[PDB]
């Protein structure tokens, strides 16, 4: 409808795939080459389905901060025959708050879904499903089951991936440029 949705659509159309694990179907953001991200609670194994194609996982790393606290981001390298458009220059270099963000989801349950979530708070610490988690972004939208892995954008920046909600608020794990050097 506006330039927020324009940027979100450009990321969804070229940099997302549908990832299926034994824990469900997720929006999965491709960042560069064969490297993508997914919430750690997806429990990625040796094999994953990418757009319903059986795919070997060449490497997977559950990120933690230097306090050894969960970040809820897993970086995956896929045995895929095609590279992602390199979007690393759209990743923030620091923790920050944002105005006017969009949460974008693409699965069998939620095809071509775009949610204007509004202001995003650097929330920091969250007990997420009982796991202490750092670098959490918060938005005041009642997100639902099936939106995990959804991409959080502003105009010109890809700032996080949706990892949970409490029925009134939604929470994303930050994406930082330093994760993908
Ligand atoms: O919070 C929500 C999500 C959705 I999809 C529909 C209605 N409310």
mmCIF file of C-alpha atoms and ligand atoms in Angstrom:
data_model
loop_
_atom_site.group_PDB
_atom_site.id
_atom_site.type_symbol
_atom_site.label_atom_id
_atom_site.label_comp_id
_atom_site.label_asym_id
_atom_site.label_seq_id
_atom_site.Cartn_x
_atom_site.Cartn_y
_atom_site.Cartn_z
ATOM 1 C CA UNK A 1 0.000 0.000 0.000
ATOM 2 C CA UNK A 2 3.033 2.318 0.727
ATOM 3 C CA UNK A 3 6.886 2.289 0.692
ATOM 4 C CA UNK A 4 7.081 0.067 3.844
ATOM 5 C CA UNK A 5 5.078 -2.678 2.068
ATOM 6 C CA UNK A 6 7.123 -1.997 -1.119
ATOM 7 C CA UNK A 7 10.436 -2.837 0.653
ATOM 8 C CA UNK A 8 8.841 -5.843 2.500
ATOM 9 C CA UNK A 9 7.466 -7.238 -0.813
ATOM 10 C CA UNK A 10 10.915 -6.935 -2.551
ATOM 11 C CA UNK A 11 12.499 -9.000 0.291
ATOM 12 C CA UNK A 12 9.699 -11.635 0.306
ATOM 13 C CA UNK A 13 9.687 -12.141 -3.512
ATOM 14 C CA UNK A 14 13.478 -12.815 -3.839
ATOM 15 C CA UNK A 15 14.884 -13.673 -0.367
ATOM 16 C CA UNK A 16 12.378 -16.122 1.255
ATOM 17 C CA UNK A 17 11.679 -19.864 0.987
ATOM 18 C CA UNK A 18 9.234 -22.091 2.856
ATOM 19 C CA UNK A 19 11.273 -24.268 5.300
ATOM 20 C CA UNK A 20 9.709 -27.442 6.795
ATOM 21 C CA UNK A 21 11.236 -29.296 9.795
ATOM 22 C CA UNK A 22 9.624 -31.921 12.110
ATOM 23 C CA UNK A 23 8.465 -28.876 14.239
ATOM 24 C CA UNK A 24 6.430 -27.271 11.363
ATOM 25 C CA UNK A 25 6.496 -24.917 8.339
ATOM 26 C CA UNK A 26 8.457 -21.607 8.744
ATOM 27 C CA UNK A 27 9.150 -18.466 6.728
ATOM 28 C CA UNK A 28 12.924 -18.659 6.097
ATOM 29 C CA UNK A 29 14.994 -15.579 5.103
ATOM 30 C CA UNK A 30 17.901 -16.157 2.658
ATOM 31 C CA UNK A 31 20.698 -13.629 3.392
ATOM 32 C CA UNK A 32 23.505 -14.423 0.826
ATOM 33 C CA UNK A 33 24.969 -17.375 -1.188
ATOM 34 C CA UNK A 34 23.258 -20.544 0.311
ATOM 35 C CA UNK A 35 23.046 -19.029 3.876
ATOM 36 C CA UNK A 36 19.599 -18.511 5.489
ATOM 37 C CA UNK A 37 18.149 -17.934 9.009
ATOM 38 C CA UNK A 38 15.319 -19.588 10.966
ATOM 39 C CA UNK A 39 14.219 -19.549 14.652
ATOM 40 C CA UNK A 40 16.300 -22.006 16.732
ATOM 41 C CA UNK A 41 13.049 -23.652 18.008
ATOM 42 C CA UNK A 42 12.543 -24.988 14.394
ATOM 43 C CA UNK A 43 15.145 -27.678 15.491
ATOM 44 C CA UNK A 44 16.970 -27.912 12.107
ATOM 45 C CA UNK A 45 18.501 -31.389 11.477
ATOM 46 C CA UNK A 46 20.677 -32.958 8.726
ATOM 47 C CA UNK A 47 17.780 -32.749 6.170
ATOM 48 C CA UNK A 48 15.213 -29.933 5.740
ATOM 49 C CA UNK A 49 12.428 -29.372 3.125
ATOM 50 C CA UNK A 50 12.877 -26.113 1.105
ATOM 51 C CA UNK A 51 9.762 -25.280 -1.026
ATOM 52 C CA UNK A 52 8.857 -29.038 -0.566
ATOM 53 C CA UNK A 53 12.276 -30.226 -1.948
ATOM 54 C CA UNK A 54 14.408 -32.558 0.243
ATOM 55 C CA UNK A 55 17.609 -30.532 0.956
ATOM 56 C CA UNK A 56 20.833 -31.503 2.844
ATOM 57 C CA UNK A 57 21.898 -29.060 5.610
ATOM 58 C CA UNK A 58 25.667 -28.427 5.106
ATOM 59 C CA UNK A 59 26.026 -26.504 8.427
ATOM 60 C CA UNK A 60 23.735 -25.104 11.152
ATOM 61 C CA UNK A 61 24.702 -22.841 14.074
ATOM 62 C CA UNK A 62 22.390 -21.806 16.978
ATOM 63 C CA UNK A 63 23.661 -18.298 17.882
ATOM 64 C CA UNK A 64 24.310 -17.271 21.512
ATOM 65 C CA UNK A 65 25.736 -13.960 22.836
ATOM 66 C CA UNK A 66 29.114 -13.689 24.648
ATOM 67 C CA UNK A 67 27.205 -14.149 27.989
ATOM 68 C CA UNK A 68 26.262 -17.632 26.517
ATOM 69 C CA UNK A 69 22.585 -16.469 26.345
ATOM 70 C CA UNK A 70 20.225 -17.802 23.611
ATOM 71 C CA UNK A 71 19.636 -15.380 20.655
ATOM 72 C CA UNK A 72 16.964 -17.701 19.067
ATOM 73 C CA UNK A 73 18.623 -17.355 15.564
ATOM 74 C CA UNK A 74 19.944 -20.454 13.726
ATOM 75 C CA UNK A 75 22.138 -19.784 10.647
ATOM 76 C CA UNK A 76 21.762 -22.584 8.070
ATOM 77 C CA UNK A 77 23.885 -23.365 5.013
ATOM 78 C CA UNK A 78 21.708 -25.245 2.429
ATOM 79 C CA UNK A 79 22.867 -27.775 -0.240
ATOM 80 C CA UNK A 80 20.813 -25.738 -2.771
ATOM 81 C CA UNK A 81 21.663 -25.327 -6.504
ATOM 82 C CA UNK A 82 20.920 -21.550 -6.474
ATOM 83 C CA UNK A 83 22.248 -18.519 -4.500
ATOM 84 C CA UNK A 84 20.154 -15.874 -2.702
ATOM 85 C CA UNK A 85 20.410 -12.230 -3.708
ATOM 86 C CA UNK A 86 22.983 -10.755 -1.245
ATOM 87 C CA UNK A 87 20.939 -8.534 1.204
ATOM 88 C CA UNK A 88 23.649 -8.109 3.908
ATOM 89 C CA UNK A 89 23.879 -4.314 3.176
ATOM 90 C CA UNK A 90 20.225 -4.018 4.478
ATOM 91 C CA UNK A 91 21.174 -5.429 7.944
ATOM 92 C CA UNK A 92 21.632 -2.978 10.850
ATOM 93 C CA UNK A 93 25.138 -2.824 12.445
ATOM 94 C CA UNK A 94 23.801 -2.043 16.000
ATOM 95 C CA UNK A 95 20.934 -2.785 18.460
ATOM 96 C CA UNK A 96 18.236 -0.059 17.994
ATOM 97 C CA UNK A 97 14.510 0.852 18.193
ATOM 98 C CA UNK A 98 12.569 1.515 14.926
ATOM 99 C CA UNK A 99 9.422 3.241 13.670
ATOM 100 C CA UNK A 100 6.808 1.867 11.261
ATOM 101 C CA UNK A 101 7.866 -1.811 10.745
ATOM 102 C CA UNK A 102 6.182 -4.565 8.620
ATOM 103 C CA UNK A 103 6.091 -8.271 9.561
ATOM 104 C CA UNK A 104 5.921 -10.409 6.348
ATOM 105 C CA UNK A 105 5.068 -14.169 6.305
ATOM 106 C CA UNK A 106 4.828 -16.693 3.474
ATOM 107 C CA UNK A 107 3.697 -20.266 4.309
ATOM 108 C CA UNK A 108 0.884 -22.709 3.260
ATOM 109 C CA UNK A 109 -1.147 -21.372 6.249
ATOM 110 C CA UNK A 110 -0.334 -17.625 5.650
ATOM 111 C CA UNK A 111 0.481 -16.920 1.933
ATOM 112 C CA UNK A 112 1.548 -13.357 0.905
ATOM 113 C CA UNK A 113 0.805 -11.941 4.412
ATOM 114 C CA UNK A 114 2.014 -8.412 5.380
ATOM 115 C CA UNK A 115 1.246 -6.908 8.879
ATOM 116 C CA UNK A 116 1.949 -3.231 9.704
ATOM 117 C CA UNK A 117 3.131 -3.792 13.330
ATOM 118 C CA UNK A 118 4.066 -0.099 14.042
ATOM 119 C CA UNK A 119 6.779 1.015 16.510
ATOM 120 C CA UNK A 120 9.496 -1.564 17.425
ATOM 121 C CA UNK A 121 11.107 -1.396 20.955
ATOM 122 C CA UNK A 122 14.612 -2.702 21.762
ATOM 123 C CA UNK A 123 13.082 -4.886 24.545
ATOM 124 C CA UNK A 124 16.336 -6.772 25.322
ATOM 125 C CA UNK A 125 15.791 -9.665 27.752
ATOM 126 C CA UNK A 126 12.790 -12.026 27.313
ATOM 127 C CA UNK A 127 11.945 -15.353 28.957
ATOM 128 C CA UNK A 128 10.845 -16.976 25.634
ATOM 129 C CA UNK A 129 8.999 -20.299 26.208
ATOM 130 C CA UNK A 130 11.044 -20.631 29.460
ATOM 131 C CA UNK A 131 14.455 -19.875 27.760
ATOM 132 C CA UNK A 132 16.305 -16.641 28.770
ATOM 133 C CA UNK A 133 16.799 -14.820 25.426
ATOM 134 C CA UNK A 134 18.673 -11.558 24.543
ATOM 135 C CA UNK A 135 18.425 -8.937 21.711
ATOM 136 C CA UNK A 136 14.576 -9.177 21.512
ATOM 137 C CA UNK A 137 12.535 -6.597 19.515
ATOM 138 C CA UNK A 138 8.896 -6.035 20.651
ATOM 139 C CA UNK A 139 5.863 -4.780 18.659
ATOM 140 C CA UNK A 140 2.291 -4.210 19.901
ATOM 141 C CA UNK A 141 0.474 -6.576 17.487
ATOM 142 C CA UNK A 142 -1.296 -9.812 18.526
ATOM 143 C CA UNK A 143 0.718 -12.214 16.327
ATOM 144 C CA UNK A 144 -0.349 -15.900 16.034
ATOM 145 C CA UNK A 145 1.087 -19.414 15.719
ATOM 146 C CA UNK A 146 2.501 -19.976 12.182
ATOM 147 C CA UNK A 147 4.207 -16.501 11.873
ATOM 148 C CA UNK A 148 7.592 -17.663 13.322
ATOM 149 C CA UNK A 149 10.451 -16.892 10.922
ATOM 150 C CA UNK A 150 8.450 -13.933 9.551
ATOM 151 C CA UNK A 151 10.671 -11.074 8.388
ATOM 152 C CA UNK A 152 10.589 -7.708 10.203
ATOM 153 C CA UNK A 153 11.522 -4.772 7.940
ATOM 154 C CA UNK A 154 11.543 -0.990 7.794
ATOM 155 C CA UNK A 155 12.133 1.019 4.601
ATOM 156 C CA UNK A 156 15.694 0.027 3.608
ATOM 157 C CA UNK A 157 16.391 -2.281 6.630
ATOM 158 C CA UNK A 158 15.848 -5.995 7.462
ATOM 159 C CA UNK A 159 15.904 -5.851 11.304
ATOM 160 C CA UNK A 160 14.730 -9.250 12.660
ATOM 161 C CA UNK A 161 12.792 -12.518 12.445
ATOM 162 C CA UNK A 162 9.581 -13.237 14.401
ATOM 163 C CA UNK A 163 10.175 -15.812 17.237
ATOM 164 C CA UNK A 164 7.063 -15.622 19.497
ATOM 165 C CA UNK A 165 4.167 -13.735 21.093
ATOM 166 C CA UNK A 166 2.091 -13.458 24.306
ATOM 167 C CA UNK A 167 -1.318 -12.899 22.572
ATOM 168 C CA UNK A 168 -1.060 -9.015 22.751
ATOM 169 C CA UNK A 169 2.597 -8.436 21.687
ATOM 170 C CA UNK A 170 4.977 -10.048 19.155
ATOM 171 C CA UNK A 171 8.729 -10.587 19.574
ATOM 172 C CA UNK A 172 11.536 -10.826 16.988
ATOM 173 C CA UNK A 173 15.236 -11.806 17.285
ATOM 174 C CA UNK A 174 17.527 -9.014 15.989
ATOM 175 C CA UNK A 175 19.487 -9.533 12.782
ATOM 176 C CA UNK A 176 22.911 -7.777 12.877
ATOM 177 C CA UNK A 177 25.422 -7.430 9.976
ATOM 178 C CA UNK A 178 28.134 -8.998 12.245
ATOM 179 C CA UNK A 179 26.292 -12.402 12.239
ATOM 180 C CA UNK A 180 26.967 -12.828 8.419
ATOM 181 C CA UNK A 181 30.579 -11.658 7.902
HETATM 182 O O1 LIG B 1 -3.321 -10.904 15.529
HETATM 183 C C1 LIG B 1 -3.935 -11.351 14.587
HETATM 184 C C2 LIG B 1 -3.364 -12.053 13.515
HETATM 185 C C3 LIG B 1 -4.160 -12.399 12.518
HETATM 186 I I1 LIG B 1 -3.365 -13.391 10.913
HETATM 187 C C4 LIG B 1 -5.516 -12.170 12.426
HETATM 188 C C5 LIG B 1 -6.046 -11.504 13.460
HETATM 189 N N1 LIG B 1 -5.275 -11.106 14.499
#
